[PDB]
Design an enzyme around this catalytic site. Structure first.
Site, PDB file in Angstrom:
ATOM      1  N   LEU A   1       0.774  -1.143  -0.111  1.00 29.59           N
ATOM      2  CA  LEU A   1      -0.098   0.029   0.143  1.00 29.59           C
ATOM      3  C   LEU A   1       0.771   1.211  -0.064  1.00 29.59           C
ATOM      4  CD1 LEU A   1      -2.386  -1.254   2.787  1.00 29.59           C
ATOM      5  CD2 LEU A   1      -2.987  -1.102   0.539  1.00 29.59           C
ATOM      6  N   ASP A   2       0.322   2.399  -0.336  1.00 34.40           N
ATOM      7  CA  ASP A   2       1.081   3.638  -0.028  1.00 34.40           C
ATOM      8  C   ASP A   2       0.512   4.335   1.061  1.00 34.40           C
ATOM      9  OD1 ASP A   2      -1.419   4.903  -2.407  1.00 34.40           O
ATOM     10  OD2 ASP A   2      -1.287   5.578  -0.509  1.00 34.40           O
ATOM     11  N   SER A   3       0.921   5.693   1.241  1.00 32.65           N
ATOM     12  CA  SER A   3       0.917   6.283   2.404  1.00 32.65           C
ATOM     13  C   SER A   3      -0.595   7.108   2.518  1.00 32.65           C
ATOM     14  CB  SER A   3       1.879   7.458   2.441  1.00 32.65           C
ATOM     15  OG  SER A   3       1.744   8.309   1.547  1.00 32.65           O
TER      16      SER A   3
END
Ligand SMILES: CCCCCCCCCCCCCCCCCC(=O)OC[C@H](COP(=O)([O-])OCC(O)COP(=O)([O-])OC[C@@H](COC(=O)CCCCCCCCCCCCCCCCC)OC(=O)CCCCCCCCCCCCCCCCC)OC(=O)CCCCCCCCCCCCCCCCC
Ligand SMILES: CCCCCCCCCCCCCCCCCC(=O)OC[C@H](COP(=O)(O)OCCN)OC(=O)CCCCCCCCCCCCCCCCC
Ligand SMILES: CCCCCCCCCCCCCCCCCC(=O)OC[C@H](COP(=O)(O)OCCN)OC(=O)CCCCCCCCCCCCCCCCC
Ligand SMILES: CCCCCCCCCCCCO[C@@H]1O[C@H](CO)[C@@H](O[C@H]2O[C@H](CO)[C@@H](O)[C@H](O)[C@H]2O)[C@H](O)[C@H]1O
Ligand SMILES: CCCCCCCCCCCCO[C@@H]1O[C@H](CO)[C@@H](O[C@H]2O[C@H](CO)[C@@H](O)[C@H](O)[C@H]2O)[C@H](O)[C@H]1O
Ligand SMILES: CCCCCCCCCCCCO[C@@H]1O[C@H](CO)[C@@H](O[C@H]2O[C@H](CO)[C@@H](O)[C@H](O)[C@H]2O)[C@H](O)[C@H]1O
Ligand SMILES: CCCCCCCCCCCCO[C@@H]1O[C@H](CO)[C@@H](O[C@H]2O[C@H](CO)[C@@H](O)[C@H](O)[C@H]2O)[C@H](O)[C@H]1O
Ligand SMILES: CCCCCCCCCCCCO[C@@H]1O[C@H](CO)[C@@H](O[C@H]2O[C@H](CO)[C@@H](O)[C@H](O)[C@H]2O)[C@H](O)[C@H]1O
Ligand SMILES: CCCCCCCCCCCCO[C@@H]1O[C@H](CO)[C@@H](O[C@H]2O[C@H](CO)[C@@H](O)[C@H](O)[C@H]2O)[C@H](O)[C@H]1O
Lengths: 86, 171, 127, 155, 172, 102, 606
Positions: free
Chosen positions: A40-42
Site C-alpha cells: 500500500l501507499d501512504s
C-alpha cells in the site's frame, strides 16, 4: 464500558483490515508492513489510521499516526493509550 | 392576649362556614384532624409541662422609666453638663421615634397582606397614617448626617420655623 | 475564495501563510537551532524532574524573569517623555476630572430641586 | 537566581542584543526587544502575540495546561493568553466580516422594533369598560370627593 | 515548517476527510464523496515538479479553508472535545503516597510492599541512567528530544519513571 | 516513515515496565485490610425527618412566633354571596337576580 | 393556619437536614445519594399539603418568624411568602428534582465524588427555594446569588478541564453584570419607598417606577440569559448532564423570569417597561432558536431551546401576562428536564458521545428513551393537550390579540416555527436513519433508576399541564374571542415548521455537496457574538489592567511624581552641601559673605 484486552484489540484491528478491499485477508498478519509486505501507499495508510480511530472512538495525532506501519504497531499504540496490560 | 390590640390592630375575623357541594371526601378535613392528633396534642402537652415549671418560679422584669430633663433649648451655650443630659434624652427619643415609624410600617404591611386584591381601597387609613408619620419623622431627623446631635436638630427646626414664618408674612 | 483578512484576535492559519512554504536551507537551519535550544532545556529539566532524591520545586529562570520583568524591572527602564507623559496625563488625571463634573453637576442639579421643593422625597427617610 | 540572569535595560549594541538573547534562551535572530519607548519593558523579549490555545495540543509539554516548556521565555502577557482567557486562534469567518454580520443583524433588529412600536398591532375592538365610575373607589380614589361619572351604554 | 512536503499533504488529506465527514453525516454519502476526494489526490500523486507540487498544496489549503465545516466533529476525548481533560481532577501523582499516614498504608500491605520494590528499583537504576545520557550526548547538549534505549541487560531506558508510573487514563 | 530501530527498542522497554506497573496496581484478595423492611425504613425516616421536625416547628410557631404581633399574617378568607360567617352567624345576602341569558 | 404554616416550613427544614447531617459527620456515608433522594421525595409530599389548601380556598400567608436586624426605620426579618407563586412552584421543582436525583444516582454512579455532587445539588435547590419564597429583597438576594455560586461550582464540576473553568467563570461574569440591576433596584426601593419588603412596595405603588424596573429587567436579563447576556447558558453545558437538567428546568435560569413575575404589580402599570421586555424577549426567542437549527452537540441544542423558551416567557411578561409566564415556567420544567435526561441516556450508552452526527438508528435500540424523547419534543412544540400546550398555546393567542409591537409578534411566531425545526433535528438525527456510532455496541437503557426517573417526568409531561390549568384560580380575563386565523396561528406555524424541517432533513441524504451560506455560518457560530465579544472584551480590559493601571500609573507615574522625585532632590542637595574642599580660606570667606548680606540685604543689624 467493557474493558479492552490485548487479544480483543488485536482482533478488531485485524477485523477492520479484512474489510479493506486493498488488502488480501489471507496474506494479512499482525506483522505485515503496510507497504513492504502489503504494497500500500501512504494515502492508504492515512485511511487505515482514520478507520482505526473510528473503530475505537479516539484520535491518533498525525505525528504518532505516521509511524504505525504494521497491525502490531497499532495494537501496541492503542493498548498504551488505554492502559491495557492483560 | 400577648400584645396590645390597640397598638397592633386586627380587624375582626370573618370565616365562611363550609359549604361542600361534592360527595367526595375533603382531603384537608382529615389531614387537619391528623395534624391535631399527631402534632398539636403532643406539642400541647409538652408545653403545659413547661408552663407548670414556670408557674413555680414566677419573677418579674420592668420597663425602664426615663424622667424628663430639660431639652437642648434650655441649655446654656457650651454648658456640657446640661448639654449632656439633653443630648442623651434627644438620642433616646430618636430611637423611640424610629420604632414608632416601624410600628406604623408594620401596620401598613400587615394590612396589605390581609386585604389581598382589595388592599388598594381597604388600606387607605393605614397608608394615610403612614404618610403623615413619615412626614413628621422626615422633618425632625432627615439630612442631619452621621454626626447628628440635638443641636443640629434644633438648628434644622429653627430654619424650618423661619421659612414658615416668612411665607405666613407673605399671607 | 476570498482571502484571509487576519486580525489581532483572529490570527492567520499557518496553512494559508506563504512563510510556511517555499522553505530554504537558511530557514531549515534556523528551525534546527530552535529545536536544539528546546532539547537542551528539556534535558536540563528532565535530569531534575526524574531525579529520585529531588523533593521540592524545580526553579524555572524563565518564570522568575517573567515575574521580575513585570514588576521590579519596569522603573529602571522607564523614561519620562512625550509618550509616557501624554498617556500618564490622559489615563491618570483625565478620568478623575471627568467623573468630577458628572457627579458635581448631578449633585448640584438635585440640590437646587430640593431647595425649591421640586424633588419628591415623600417617603425618603433612610440615607 | 543572579543579576546577570535577570531582565535588564534596553539593549543598545549588537553584542548586548546577543547577551540578552542568550539570557532568554533565544537565537540572536529570533530575539527582538520591545521598542524603547520608555514604558519599562527593558530587554524582555517581544514574542508573537498568540494565545496559548494556539499551541500544539499533542506535543508533550512540561506544563500541559499552560502549554509551556520549562525554561522557554514567557510572553509578557502570558497570564492574559492562558487557555481560560484571550483566544486568538483563527476563525472560519474573517474578523471584520463577522463584525459586519453581527452588527448588521443587531442594528436591523433594533430598527424593526422601532417601526413595530410606531405601527402597533391590535384588534378591532373598543376600549374595555369597567363599572362604578371606572372602579374609581377600588383603584384608590378619595371617598370624600365625588368623581366625575363615567357612563357606559349598550350597543 | 519542520514538516516535510509529504507530511503536509498527508495531514491535509486527513483533515479534509474529517471535515468532509462532518458535512455528509450519512455514511453512504460520505463514502461517495471521500472517494471523489481521494481521486483528486491520486490525480497529482506523481507530480515530480516540487514547484508545481507546492503550488498544488497552496491552492488545496486555500480550498479547504473556504470549504471547512464551521463546527466539525471532534472525538470526545480529543483536544477541544466535550470530554477533553474531563478526568484530570482524578489523576493524582504517585508521590502523594509517600505522605500517607501509616494507618492508611496498613490497609494495603501488599500494594505498599510492591511500591517499595519500584522505589528501590528507581534508586538503583538512576546513576546508570544519568551516566548513559552523559556518554551518548554530544558536546553542546542534545539536538533532539529523542531519548536512547537501554544498551545492556539490567539497564532501564533512561528517564522512565514518569512514563511508567503516570496516572491511568481512567484513574478513579 | 515508521519507527527507527533505536526508537522501537525504547518503546519496547518502556512498555514492559508500564504493563508491569499497571499489573502491580491490582488489589490482592485481602485488601483493603479494614480495621474492626422498606416500610420500617420509610417508617423510621418519616419519624425522624417529618414528625420530629414538625413537632419542633409547631411548638416554635404556636408558642413563640404567633405570640408576637404580625408575625404570621393570613390573607383574609374570600367571602362569597350566600356564605355564612362562622364567627357571628351572619348570612351574606345573595347577589341580585341575573338576566339569566344563556 | 397551624397546619398550613407548620407544613410549609418543614418542607424547607427537611431539605437542610442532609446538609446538616453531612457537615456534622453524623450521617451514614454508605448511600448518601439515596438519603438525599429520599429527603426530596418526602419534601414533595409535605409541600403538597399547603398547595392543596391554597387550591381549595386560596389560603395564603406570610411568615416572619425571626427578627434579624433593624437599621433605624428598616426592619429586616427572615420572612417567607407562601402565596400563589410559591405554592405551585415548590411542588413542581421538588417533583422534577426528585426525578433528576434518581437519574443522577445512575448517571453519576462511577463519579468518585458522588456524595459531594448530591450535596451541591441539594444546596442548589435550597438556594432556589430561598429565592422563591423570599418576601423581602434582601432575603431574595441571598437566593439570587446562592444559585449563581452553586451554578458556578456545578458547571465547573470537572475542574481539571480548562473549558469547564472558563464556562463556570463566564456564568458568574454574566450573572454579576445582571446583578448590577438588582442592586440598583434595592437602592431605589430603599431610597424612595424606605423598604425592601414586597408588601410595602406594592402598597405604596410608585408611579415613577422606570428606574427600579429597568434594574429588575437587567437582573432578569443576566439570570434568564436574554440577548446581550445570553452566551453563558449554552456554555454552561460543560457541567454534568444532571446539572443541565436542574439548571435549565428549575433552579437558576428560571429565577430571572420569576423575579419579574413577583413584581407584576409594578410592571402592569408601566407601559415603557412592557415594551422593552417584549422586544427583549422577542429577539431572544428568535435569535437562540436560530442558533439551535445548526448545532450538533445534543446538549447545546437543548441549551439553546431553553434560551428560546425563556425568551418566550420574557415576551409573556412584556404583554402584561405574568400568570401565563408563570404557568410556562411550571409546564416547561417537566418536559425540558426530561429531554435533558433522555439525552443523558443516549450520551451514556454511546460512551460520552454528544454529537448528533454520530448517533442515529436509536429509535428501536433504545425504545423507552425514544418514547420519552418524542413525548418531550411534542410537548415542547405545543402538541394539543400535552403539558406544553396549556401554557404555550395561550401565550401565543394572547400575543396576537394584544396591543403589541408588530415586530415582536412576528419574531415570536417565526421562533415558534423554529422550535419545530430543531426538535425535528434531534429526532431525525439521534433516532432515525442508520446508526453512525462506533462498532462496539453497548446500548443499554435497562437500569430501573433510569427508567423510573424518566417515567415520572413522562407522566408529568402528559398530564401535569392539564392538572395544573384545571386547579389554579383565575386571576385575569382570558381572551377567547378572536379570528379563526389568530386562534390557530400557534398550531399552523408549528406544523409548517415540521413539514419544512422534514424536507431539509431529507436533503442531507442526497448525494450533493453545497458550499455553506453566510446564513448557515451565522447560525452555527452563534451570530459571532461569543467569538467577537469573548475575545474583544477580555482583551481590552485585561490589557488596560497591565499596561495602564499597573505599569504606567502604579509602577511609574505614581512613583515618579512623589517618592522618586523627592528622594532625588534630597540626594542632590546633600551633595551640594557636603562637597567642600575642607579649606579654612574658603569657609571664612563665606563667613564674610554671610555677615555682609546679613546687614545689606536683610538688615539684621537694625
Ligand atoms: C456556637 C459555636 C458554634 C461553632 C460553629 C459551628 C459550625 C462549625 C462546625 C464545623 C465542624 C463540623 C465538621 O466536622 O464539618 C464537616 C465538614 C464535612 O466534612 P468532609 O466530608 O470531610 O468535607 C470536607 C470538604 O472540605 C468538603 O468540601 P465541600 O465543598 O464538599 O463542602 C464544604 C462547604 C463548607 O460548608 C458549607 O458551605 C455549608 C453549606 C452552606 C450552608 O463548602 C461548600 O459547600 C461550598 C458551597 C457554598 C454554598 C453557599 C451557597 C449560598 C447559601 C447561602 C445561604 C445561607 C443561609 C444562611 O467539613 C467541612 O467542610 C468544614 C467546613 C466548615 C465551614 C462551615 C461553613 C458554613 C457555610
Ligand atoms: C456592545 C453591544 C452588544 C451588547 C453587549 C452586552 C454585554 C455583553 C458582553 C459581556 C462581557 C463580554 C466578556 C465576556 C467574556 C466571557 O464570557 O468569558 C469567557 C472568555 C472565553 O470564553 P469562551 O468564548 O467560551 O472560550 C471557550 C474556550 N476556548 O473567557 C475570558 O476571557 C474571561 C476571563 C478573563 C476575564 C476578562 C474580564 C473582562 C471584563 C469585561 C466584562 C465586563 C466587565 C464589567 C463591565 C461591564 C458592566 C457594565
Ligand atoms: C433577610 C433575612 C436574612 C437572614 C440572614 C441570616 C441568616 C442566617 C441563618 C438563620 C438561621 C435561622 C434562624 C431562625 C430560627 C430562629 C432563630 C432564633 O434564634 O430564634 C430566637 C427567637 C428570637 O426572637 P425574635 O423576636 O424573633 O428576634 C430576636 C432578635 N435577634 O426567639 C425564639 O423564638 C425562641 C425559640 C425557642 C424555640 C423552642 C423550640 C426549640 C426546639 C429544640 C430545637 C432543637
Ligand atoms: C485629585 C482628583 C482631582 C479631580 C478634580 C477635583 C476638583 C475638586 C474641586 C473641589 C470643590 C471646589 O468647589 C467648591 O464647591 C463648593 C460647593 O459645594 C463651594 O461651597 C461654597 O460655595 C457654594 C456655592 O458655590 C455656597 O453654597 C457656599 O458658599 C459654599 O457651599 C466651595 O466654595 C467651592 O470651593
Ligand atoms: C428569521 C430571521 C429574521 C431576522 C433576519 C435579520 C436579517 C439581518 C441581516 C443583516 C445583514 C448585515 O450584514 C451585511 O451583509 C452583507 C453581505 O455580506 C455585508 O456585505 C459585505 O460582504 C461582501 C463583501 O464580500 C459585500 O456584500 C460587501 O462588500 C460587504 O459590505 C455587509 O457588510 C453586512 O453589513
Ligand atoms: C433541628 C433538627 C430537628 C430534627 C433532628 C432529628 C434528628 C434525627 C436524626 C436521624 C438520623 C439522621 O441521619 C441519617 O438519617 C438517615 C435516615 O434516617 C440514615 O440513612 C439511612 O436511611 C437512608 C434512606 O432511608 C439511606 O440512604 C441510608 O443508607 C441509611 O443508612 C443515616 O444512617 C443517618 O445518619
Ligand atoms: C402540533 C404537532 C404537529 C406535528 C406535525 C408532524 C409532521 C407532519 C407531517 C410532515 C410531512 C410528512 O412526511 C411527508 O411524507 C413522506 C414521509 O413518509 C415524505 O417522503 C420522503 O420520505 C423519504 C424518507 O426516506 C425521503 O427520502 C424522500 O425524499 C421523501 O419521499 C415527504 O417528503 C413528506 O412530505
Ligand atoms: C506620597 C506623599 C508622601 C511620600 C513620601 C515618600 C518619601 C520617600 C520614601 C522612600 C525613600 C527611599 O529612598 C530611596 O528610594 C530609592 C528609590 O526611590 C531606592 O533606590 C532604588 O530606586 C532607585 C531609583 O528608582 C535606584 O537608583 C536604586 O538602584 C534602587 O535601589 C532606595 O533604596 C531608597 O533608599
Ligand atoms: C512630603 C515630604 C516627604 C518627605 C519624606 C522624607 C524624605 C527622605 C529623603 C531621603 C533621600 C535619600 O535617599 C536617596 O535617594 C536616591 C534616589 O535618587 C537613592 O539613589 C538611588 O537612585 C539614584 C538615581 O535614581 C542612583 O544614582 C543611586 O545609585 C541609587 O542609590 C539613594 O540610594 C537614597 O539614599
Amino acid at each position: 464500558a467493557p474493558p479492552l484486552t490485548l487479544e480483543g484489540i488485536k482482533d478488531r484491528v485485524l477485523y477492520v483490515l479484512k474489510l479493506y478491499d486493498k488488502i488480501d485477508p489471507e496474506k494479512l498478519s499482525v506483522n505485515s508492513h503496510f507497504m513492504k509486505d502489503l504494497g500500500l501507499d501512504s494515502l492508504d495508510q492515512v485511511e487505515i489510521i482514520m478507520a482505526m480511530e473510528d473503530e475505537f472512538g479516539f484520535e491518533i495525532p498525525d505525528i504518532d499516526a505516521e509511524k504505525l506501519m504494521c497491525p502490531q504497531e497499532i495494537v501496541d499504540y492503542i493498548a498504551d493509550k488505554k492502559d491495557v496490560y492483560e | 392576649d400577648s400584645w396590645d390590640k390597640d397598638v397592633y390592630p386586627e380587624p375582626p375575623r370573618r370565616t365562611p362556614a363550609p359549604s361542600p357541594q361534592t360527595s367526595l371526601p375533603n382531603p384537608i378535613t382529615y389531614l387537619t384532624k391528623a395534624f391535631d392528633l399527631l402534632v398539636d396534642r403532643p406539642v400541647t402537652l409538652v408545653r403545659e409541662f413547661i408552663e407548670r415549671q414556670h408557674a413555680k418560679n414566677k419573677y418579674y422584669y420592668y420597663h425602664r422609666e426615663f424622667r424628663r430633663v430639660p431639652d437642648i433649648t434650655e441649655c446654656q451655650e457650651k454648658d456640657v453638663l446640661c448639654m449632656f443630659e439633653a443630648e442623651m434624652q434627644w438620642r433616646r427619643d430618636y430611637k423611640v421615634d424610629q420604632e414608632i415609624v416601624n410600628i406604623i410600617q408594620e401596620r401598613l404591611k400587615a394590612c396589605q397582606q390581609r386585604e389581598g386584591e382589595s388592599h388598594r381601597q381597604n388600606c387607605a387609613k393605614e397608608l394615610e397614617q403612614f404618610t403623615q408619620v413619615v412626614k413628621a419623622y422626615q422633618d425632625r431627623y432627615h439630612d442631619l448626617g452621621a454626626h447628628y446631635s440635638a443641636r443640629k436638630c434644633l438648628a434644622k427646626q429653627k430654619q424650618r420655623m423661619l421659612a414658615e414664618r416668612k411665607a405666613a408674612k407673605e399671607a | 475564495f476570498p482571502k484571509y483578512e487576519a486580525s489581532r484576535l483572529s490570527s492567520l492559519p499557518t496553512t494559508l501563510d506563504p512563510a510556511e512554504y517555499d522553505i530554504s536551507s537558511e530557514t531549515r537551519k534556523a528551525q534546527a537551532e530552535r529545536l536544539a535550544i528546546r532539547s537542551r532545556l528539556k534535558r536540563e529539566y528532565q535530569l531534575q524532574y526524574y531525579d529520585p532524591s529531588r523533593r521540592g520545586v524545580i526553579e524555572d529562570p524563565a518564570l522568575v524573569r517573567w515575574t521580575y520583568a513585570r514588576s521590579a524591572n519596569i522603573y529602571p527602564n522607564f523614561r519620562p517623555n512625550t509618550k509616557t507623559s501624554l498617556l500618564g496625563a490622559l489615563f491618570g488625571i483625565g478620568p478623575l476630572v471627568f467623573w468630577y463634573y458628572v457627579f458635581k453637576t448631578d449633585r448640584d442639579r438635585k440640590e437646587k430641586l430640593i431647595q425649591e421643593g421640586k424633588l419628591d422625597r415623600t417617603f425618603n427617610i433612610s440615607y | 537566581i543572579t543579576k546577570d540572569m535577570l531582565p535588564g535595560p534596553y539593549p543598545k549594541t549588537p553584542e548586548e542584543r546577543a547577551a540578552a538573547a542568550k539570557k532568554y534562551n533565544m537565537r540572536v535572530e529570533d530575539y527582538e526587544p520591545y521598542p524603547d519607548d520608555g514604558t519599562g519593558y527593558g530587554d524582555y523579549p517581544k514574542l508573537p502575540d498568540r494565545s496559548q490555545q494556539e499551541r500544539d495540543p499533542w506535543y508533550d509539554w512540561d506544563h500541559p495546561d499552560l502549554r509551556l516548556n520549562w525554561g522557554e521565555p514567557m510572553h509578557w502577557d502570558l497570564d492574559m493568553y492562558i487557555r481560560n482567557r484571550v483566544d486568538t486562534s483563527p476563525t472560519p469567518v474573517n474578523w471584520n466580516l463577522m463584525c459586519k454580520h453581527l452588527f448588521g443583524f443587531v442594528a436591523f433588529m433594533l430598527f424593526m422594533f422601532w417601526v413595530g412600536e410606531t405601527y402597533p398591532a391590535y384588534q378591532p375592538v373598543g376600549p374595555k369598560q369597567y363599572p362604578y365610575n371606572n372602579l374609581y373607589l377600588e383603584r384608590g380614589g378619595d371617598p370624600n370627593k365625588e368623581p366625575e361619572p363615567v357612563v357606559h351604554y349598550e350597543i | 515548517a519542520y514538516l516535510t512536503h509529504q507530511q503536509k499533504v498527508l495531514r491535509l488529506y486527513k483533515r479534509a476527510l474529517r471535515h468532509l465527514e462532518s458535512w455528509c453525516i450519512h455514511r453512504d454519502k460520505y463514502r461517495y464523496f471521500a472517494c471523489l476526494l481521494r481521486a483528486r489526490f491520486d490525480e497529482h500523486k506523481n507530480e515530480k515538479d516540487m514547484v508545481k507540487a507546492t503550488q498544488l498544496l497552496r491552492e488545496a489549503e486555500e480550498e479547504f479553508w473556504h470549504g471547512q465545516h464551521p463546527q466539525p466533529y471532534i472525538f470526545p476525548e480529543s483536544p477541544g472535545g466535550t470530554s477533553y481533560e474531563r478526568y484530570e481532577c482524578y489523576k493524582v501523582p504517585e508521590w502523594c503516597l509517600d505522605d500517607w499516614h501509616p494507618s492508611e498504608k496498613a490497609m494495603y500491605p501488599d500494594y505498599f510492599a510492591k511500591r517499595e520494590q519500584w522505589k528501590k528499583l528507581r534508586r538503583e537504576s538512576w546513576e546508570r541512567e544519568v551516566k548513559q545520557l552523559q556518554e551518548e550526548t554530544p558536546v553542546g547538549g542534545p539536538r533532539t528530544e529523542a531519548l536512547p534505549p537501554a544498551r545492556k541487560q539490567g539497564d532501564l531506558p533512561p528517564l522512565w519513571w514518569h512514563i511508567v508510573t503516570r496516572p491511568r487514563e481512567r484513574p478513579m | 516513515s515508521g519507527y527507527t530501530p533505536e526508537e522501537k527498542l525504547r518503546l519496547q522497554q518502556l512498555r514492559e515496565l508500564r504493563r508491569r506497573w499497571l499489573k502491580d496496581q491490582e488489589l490482592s484478595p485481602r485488601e483493603p485490610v479494614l480495621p474492626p423492611y422498606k416500610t420500617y425504613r420509610h417508617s423510621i425516616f418519616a419519624f425522624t425527618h417529618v414528625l420530629i421536625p414538625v413537632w419542633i416547628i409547631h411548638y416554635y410557631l404556636k408558642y413563640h412566633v404567633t405570640t408576637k404581633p404580625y408575625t404570621i399574617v393570613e390573607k383574609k378568607p374570600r367571602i362569597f354571596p350566600g356564605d355564612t360567617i362562622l364567627e357571628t352567624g351572619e348570612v351574606i345576602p345573595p347577589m341580585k337576580e341575573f338576566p339569566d341569558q344563556h | 393556619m397551624n397546619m398550613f404554616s407548620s407544613l410549609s416550613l418543614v418542607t424547607l427544614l427537611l431539605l437542610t437536614m442532609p446538609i446538616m447531617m453531612m457537615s456534622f459527620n453524623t450521617y451514614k456515608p454508605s448511600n448518601y445519594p439515596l438519603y438525599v433522594k429520599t429527603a426530596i421525595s418526602y419534601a414533595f409530599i409535605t409541600s403538597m399539603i399547603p398547595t392543596m389548601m391554597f387550591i381549595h380556598s386560596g389560603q395564603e400567608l406570610i411568615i416572619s418568624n425571626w427578627h434579624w436586624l433593624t437599621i433605624q426605620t428598616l426592619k429586616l426579618s427572615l420572612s417567607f411568602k407562601m402565596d400563589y407563586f410559591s405554592m405551585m412552584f415548590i411542588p413542581v421543582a421538588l417533583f422534577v428534582t426528585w426525578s433528576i436525583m434518581e437519574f443522577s444516582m445512575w448517571y453519576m454512579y462511577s463519579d468518585p465524588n458522588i456524595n459531594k455532587f448530591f450535596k451541591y445539588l441539594l444546596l442548589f435547590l435550597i438556594t432556589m427555594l430561598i429565592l422563591v419564597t423570599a418576601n423581602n429583597l434582601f432575603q431574595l438576594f441571598i437566593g439570587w446569588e446562592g444559585v449563581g455560586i452553586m451554578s458556578f461550582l456545578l458547571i465547573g464540576w470537572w475542574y481539571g478541564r480548562a473549558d469547564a473553568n472558563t464556562a463556570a467563570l463566564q456564568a458568574i461574569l454574566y450573572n454579576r453584570i445582571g446583578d448590577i440591576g438588582f442592586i440598583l433596584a434595592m437602592a431605589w426601593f430603599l431610597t424612595n419607598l424606605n423598604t425592601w419588603d414586597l408588601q410595602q412596595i406594592f402598597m405604596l405603588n410608585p408611579s415613577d417606577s422606570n428606574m427600579p424596573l429597568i434594574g429588575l429587567a437587567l437582573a432578569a436579563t443576566g439570570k434568564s440569559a436574554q440577548f446581550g447576556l445570553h452566551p453563558w447558558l449554552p456554555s454552561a453545558m460543560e457541567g454534568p448532564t444532571p446539572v443541565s437538567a436542574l439548571l435549565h428546568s428549575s433552579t437558576m435560569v428560571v429565577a430571572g423570569i420569576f423575579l419579574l413575575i413577583r413584581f407584576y404589580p409594578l410592571t402592569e402599570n408601566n407601559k415603557y417597561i412592557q415594551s422593552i421586555t417584549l422586544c427583549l424577549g422577542a429577539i431572544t426567542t428568535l435569535f437562540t432558536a436560530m442558533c439551535a437549527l445548526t448545532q450538533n452537540d445534543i446538549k447545546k441544542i437543548i441549551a439553546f431551546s431553553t434560551s428560546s423558551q425563556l425568551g418566550l416567557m420574557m415576551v409573556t411578561i412584556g404583554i402584561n401576562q405574568p400568570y401565563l409566564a408563570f404557568l410556562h415556567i411550571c409546564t416547561h420544567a417537566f418536559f425540558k428536564a426530561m429531554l435533558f435526561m433522555c439525552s443523558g441516556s443516549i450520551i451514556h450508552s454511546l460512551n460520552d458521545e454528544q454529537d448528533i452526527r454520530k448517533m442515529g438508528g436509536l429509535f428501536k435500540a433504545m425504545p423507552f428513551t425514544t418514547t420519552a424523547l418524542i413525548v418531550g419534543s411534542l410537548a415542547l412544540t405545543g402538541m394539543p393537550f400535552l403539558t406544553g400546550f396549556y401554557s404555550k398555546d395561550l401565550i401565543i393567542e394572547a400575543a396576537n390579540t394584544s396591543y403589541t409591537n408588530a415586530w415582536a409578534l412576528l419574531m415570536t411566531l417565526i421562533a415558534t416555527s423554529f422550535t419545530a425545526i430543531y426538535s425535528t433535528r434531534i429526532i431525525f438525527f439521534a433516532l432515525l436513519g442508520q446508526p453512525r456510532f462506533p462498532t462496539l455496541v453497548n446500548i443499554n437503557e435497562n437500569n430501573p433508576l433510569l427508567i423510573n426517573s424518566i417515567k415520572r417526568l413522562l407522566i408529568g409531561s402528559l398530564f401535569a399541564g392539564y392538572i395544573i390549568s384545571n386547579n389554579i384560580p383565575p386571576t385575569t380575563i382570558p381572551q377567547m374571542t378572536m379570528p379563526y386565523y389568530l386562534k390557530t396561528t400557534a398550531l399552523i406555524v408549528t406544523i409548517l415548521g415540521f413539514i419544512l424541517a422534514l424536507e431539509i432533513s431529507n436533503m442531507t441524504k442526497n448525494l450533493k455537496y453545497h458550499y455553506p451560506s453566510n446564513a448557515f455560518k451565522f447560525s452555527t457560530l452563534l451570530g459571532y457574538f461569543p467569538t467577537i465579544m469573548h475575545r474583544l472584551a477580555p482583551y481590552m480590559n485585561l490589557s488596560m489592567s497591565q499596561k495602564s493601571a499597573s505599569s504606567l500609573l502604579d509602577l511609574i507615574w505614581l512613583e515618579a511624581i512623589l517618592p522618586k522625585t523627592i528622594s532625588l532632590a534630597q540626594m542632590k542637595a546633600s551633595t551640594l552641601v557636603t562637597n567642600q574642599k575642607g579649606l579654612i580660606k574658603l569657609y571664612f570667606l563665606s563667613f564674610l559673605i554671610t555677615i555682609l548680606i546679613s546687614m545689606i540685604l536683610f538688615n539684621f543689624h537694625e
